[PDB]
Amino acid sequence: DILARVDLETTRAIAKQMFSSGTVVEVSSDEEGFQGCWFAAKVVEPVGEDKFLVEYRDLREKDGIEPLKEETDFLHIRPPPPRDEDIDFAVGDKINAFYNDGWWVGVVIDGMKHGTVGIYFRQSQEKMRFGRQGLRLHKDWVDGTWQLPL
């Protein structure tokens, strides 16, 4: 999945450059039930040469009060993507939808009507209308550059 597209040496160096204490980022997970999800977070401090202690913007510890803190590695952290807040989704577009406090990969199945866009999620096999404000085009962070899907 992962490394076929990115370069480890480059990705590590760029993560070291960009993700210092206080830096806003997005983080991902390879735990089940989280595939194609990016969560908003902020770097607390780098950890060793490979990892970053982050504090989540929206996710909480079990009391639902204190922000969740986790270590993440350089392959599961990225900057917030540039967002073109005013664009027209076309059917077939790979998007992210802000759903249950994460950004989830989905596909546009119906163009915008009444300020909503029809979306489908392969993870859950569910489809629904999403307000335009909670949608963005999917982008990949690769070797220090943002790229659209191939």
Binding site: R60, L68, N100, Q123
Partner: peptide, 10 residues
């Protein structure tokens, strides 16, 4: 906000 498993799917 929500807990990490309130955000988890399936």
């Amino acid at each position: 906000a929500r807990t990490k498993q309130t955000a988890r799917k399936s």
